[PDB]
């Protein structure tokens, strides 16, 4: 019933880990200065 078909524990594990690159959210600053 949940999009991505993760288990409750997998959903927990993904929600606990936080990604916070000092970039910009694109669909594809995130590219920095020649760094992709």
């Amino acid at each position: 019933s949940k999009p991505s078909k993760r288990s409750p524990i997998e959903d927990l594990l993904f929600n606990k880990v936080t990604l916070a690159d000092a970039g910009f959210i694109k669909q594809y600053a995130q590219k920095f200065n020649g760094l992709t």
Binding site: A22, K26, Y28, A29, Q30, K31, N33, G34, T36
Partner: protein
Amino acid sequence: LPFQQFGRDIVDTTDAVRDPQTLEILDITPCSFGGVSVITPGTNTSNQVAVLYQGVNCTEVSVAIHADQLTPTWRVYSTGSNVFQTRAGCLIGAEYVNNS
């Protein structure tokens, strides 16, 4: 504030300026860039290749192509079906199919 003239990120890169005459605050977005990768079946089979423009939208690539802004001087012919948007980047020169 009336005193600040431009701004910087947490990594001390510039991301905004104040226009010196209108005092409007403008954001500076880097111009699109990325790597280019070439998919080749091998020259002992075919000379057809596909080009992946990594990290960019196919719309941005098509606009840069039309405006003669894209840095490489070669062009890959677009058939409409040859242009497919992936998460990795824009893949030009390969027909996407549903069959896995």
